[PDB]
Amino acid sequence: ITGINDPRLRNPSDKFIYATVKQSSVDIYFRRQVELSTMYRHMEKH
């Protein structure tokens, strides 16, 4: 994973999972922040 901004994240795939805990503060980072707000949803899955 090249960076915090990873094209691989930016290029999400159903085939390549990226996983987190719902209600983890990271999720709060995803919801509160507008700039990456699109990217949150892919993480939300699984």
């Binding site: 209600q23 983890s24 503060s25 999720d27 709060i28």
Partner: protein, 49 residues
């Protein structure tokens, strides 16, 4: 814990510890009207006391 007891030797306080019921630390949630309930988890315990 070692930090806490380090403080406890440093600080006048005495400590009793219990883990929060919810596995989550805390997050805002629940009902719509006004602002309702409070963030679930240990943080919620802190405000609740």
């Amino acid at each position: 814990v070692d930090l806490l007891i380090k403080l406890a030797r440093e600080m006048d306080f005495t400590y009793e510890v219990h883990l929060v019921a919810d596995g989550k630390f805390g997050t805002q949630e629940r009902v719509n009207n006004s602002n309702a309930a409070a963030w679930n988890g240990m943080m919620g315990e802190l405000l609740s006391g």
